[PDB]
Design an enzyme around this catalytic site. Sequence first.
Site, short mmCIF file in Angstrom:
data_model
loop_
_atom_site.label_atom_id
_atom_site.label_comp_id
_atom_site.label_asym_id
_atom_site.label_seq_id
_atom_site.Cartn_x
_atom_site.Cartn_y
_atom_site.Cartn_z
N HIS A 117 -5.28 5.90 6.14
CA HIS A 117 -4.37 6.39 5.10
C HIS A 117 -2.92 6.43 5.57
O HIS A 117 -2.15 7.33 5.25
CB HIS A 117 -4.83 7.71 4.50
CG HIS A 117 -6.02 7.54 3.62
ND1 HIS A 117 -7.30 7.79 4.07
CD2 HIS A 117 -6.14 7.07 2.36
CE1 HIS A 117 -8.16 7.50 3.10
NE2 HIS A 117 -7.48 7.07 2.06
N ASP B 259 -3.13 0.10 6.59
CA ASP B 259 -4.12 -0.19 5.56
C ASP B 259 -3.88 -1.55 4.89
O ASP B 259 -4.85 -2.22 4.53
CB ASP B 259 -4.23 0.98 4.57
CG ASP B 259 -5.03 2.17 5.14
OD1 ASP B 259 -5.67 2.03 6.21
OD2 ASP B 259 -5.01 3.27 4.54
N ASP C 76 0.85 -1.18 0.00
CA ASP C 76 0.00 0.00 0.00
C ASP C 76 0.89 1.23 0.00
O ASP C 76 1.92 1.27 0.68
CB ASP C 76 -0.94 0.01 1.21
CG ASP C 76 -1.93 1.16 1.15
OD1 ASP C 76 -2.67 1.27 0.16
OD2 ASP C 76 -1.95 1.95 2.12
N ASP D 60 -1.66 1.67 -7.02
CA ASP D 60 -0.28 1.53 -6.56
C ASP D 60 0.62 1.06 -7.69
O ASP D 60 1.72 1.58 -7.87
CB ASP D 60 -0.23 0.55 -5.40
CG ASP D 60 -1.24 0.88 -4.33
OD1 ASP D 60 -0.86 1.42 -3.27
OD2 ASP D 60 -2.45 0.66 -4.57
N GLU E 275 0.98 5.70 0.07
CA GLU E 275 0.38 7.03 0.07
C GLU E 275 1.11 7.87 -0.96
O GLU E 275 2.32 7.73 -1.16
CB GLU E 275 0.46 7.72 1.44
CG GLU E 275 -0.13 6.93 2.60
CD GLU E 275 -1.53 6.39 2.37
OE1 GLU E 275 -2.38 7.06 1.74
OE2 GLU E 275 -1.77 5.26 2.87
NA NA Z 1 -4.37 2.21 -1.14
#
Ligand code: NA
Length: 195
Positions: free
Chosen positions: A159, A164, A12, A112, A14
């Site tokens: 987030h 996550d 994951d 991603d 950001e």
């Molecule tokens: Na995500």
Amino acid sequence: GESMAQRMVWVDLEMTGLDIEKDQIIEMACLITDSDLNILAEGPNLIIKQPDELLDSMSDWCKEHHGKSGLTKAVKESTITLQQAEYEFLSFVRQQTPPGLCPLAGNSVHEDKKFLDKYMPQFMKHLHYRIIDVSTVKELCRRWYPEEYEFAPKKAASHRALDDISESIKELQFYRNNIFKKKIDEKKRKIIENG
Ligand code: NA
């Protein structure tokens, strides 16, 4: 052999936003699971330095969310470049998965993948081109299993990358346990013979 090839590379990210032409990766985490979603190894969990000017021009959504989570401040303090971060992740997957065989996994992890194909291409070269998109299973659950869909775990949706990932695995485990066909196992076979 086949067990190693059936591992999953959970990632994951950001980002400073959703614009592939301007936005940059600011946080990345990675976990390896076996084919049955058991966590085998925890990879790097990194906050990547990006310029003040980019952070200052983020959308209001990103300013609010990355601000309150502490991520924006942590990006400004980071000494980790994109290139060094990519090396940490590439070294990790080289230790954990056979080259080219294992997929990215996550919720809408194609987003991603879009960012990683552009900004961490050598990391991506270690992985398969296919993905395990938990949100594909989510969208099928909502359509085909609407009653079960109401019981999916609630997400905190912080987030932050590592937290996550964990929620993504939990969501997929929920689908496996509730909308996929039941199978025999070691315990059920012993009961059948005893009966
Ligand atoms: Na995500």
